[PDB]
Amino acid sequence: NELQSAAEELNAMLQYARSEAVSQRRAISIQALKDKDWGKGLSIGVLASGSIAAPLRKHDGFRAATLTAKEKSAVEHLTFTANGTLVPPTERTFAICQNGKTDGGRVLSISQAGRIQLEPSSKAPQSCY
């Protein structure tokens, strides 16, 4: 249940950043505040000089410290554009893992078009990154 909830919370935050970019017709970012681990705190809003000074929304981190959410290329932030795409429009892959192992883990993907998908549990991450 804990990992399901964590994956859903990360999904909701990513979706919110994208939807705000589309609705506001401008670049809205989401940033992992600690260790490039998207489960240890997030901010959403306009990114400038490496930070989001006036957040639209925050996430305090997953309750369990033993959960991690890391992206394949170790990104610390993502920026969605007015058309819903990422800049750069690079495919992203998040692995949500318990205890640093992939068993029971989940994959959250973002396509080149900016489409965010929490993949079914029948797709375990290839790595916790």
The burial of 122, by beta-carbon neighbours within 10 Å (0-12 exposed, 13-18 middle, 19 or more buried), is given as exposed
Phi and psi at residue 7, to the nearest 5°: -60, -40
Integer angstrom CA distances of residue 121 from 26, 59, 80, 92, 97? 34, 23, 26, 18, 12
Strands in 9-118 per DSSP E? 28-32, 42-45, 47-48, 51-52, 57-59, 67-71, 77-80, 92-98, 101-110, 116-118
- Identity (one letter) of the amino acid at 33? L
Identify the sign of the CA torsion 6, 124, 71, 113.
Answer: negative
Kindly list the structural domains of the chain, giving each domain's residue range(s) and its CATH number in brackets, ordered by start: 1-129 (3.55.40.10)
Measured from the Cβ of residue 98, the count of other Cβ atoms closer than 10 Å reads 18
Q: Enter the resolution in angstroms.
A: 1.4
Distance between CA atoms of residues 23 and 82, nearest Å: 8
